[PDB]
């Protein structure tokens, strides 16, 4: 059956510096991870590799508690992540999220 495994993209609390340090070593654009921001408690950040840069997206929450980056809302970080596997996380370029390797 569909193997029940933890998600390899949740790195918990790690500095923005170590995530950039780790993701710059990734082979493919879209390589990403969700981290718990240390700039403010309970906030999450999405770090994605693109070219020789690592882009950081802040995960926002609305009045009902849903998550979002731009306009579409998600009931979980899990659905937000999967959504951006097939729809770009970026406004300026097409960047699709893909698992680290």
């Amino acid at each position: 059956g569909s193997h029940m495994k933890p998600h390899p993209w949740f790195f918990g609390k790690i500095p923005r510096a170590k995530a950039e340090e780790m993701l710059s070593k990734q082979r493919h654009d879209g390589a990403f991870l969700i981290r718990e921001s240390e700039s403010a408690p309970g906030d999450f950040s999405l770090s994605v590799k693109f070219g020789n840069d690592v882009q950081h997206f802040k995960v926002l929450r609305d009045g009902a508690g849903k998550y979002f980056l731009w306009v579409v809302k998600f009931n979980s970080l899990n659905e937000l992540v999967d959504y951006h596997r097939s729809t770009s996380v970026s406004r300026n370029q097409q960047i699709f999220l893909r698992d680290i390797e």
């Binding site: 950040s45 882009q55 950081h56 802040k58 926002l60 980056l69 731009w70 406004r91």
Partner: peptide
């Protein structure tokens, strides 16, 4: 900073 506007 972050790529997407935060407010």
């Amino acid at each position: 900073g972050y790529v997407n506007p935060t407010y």
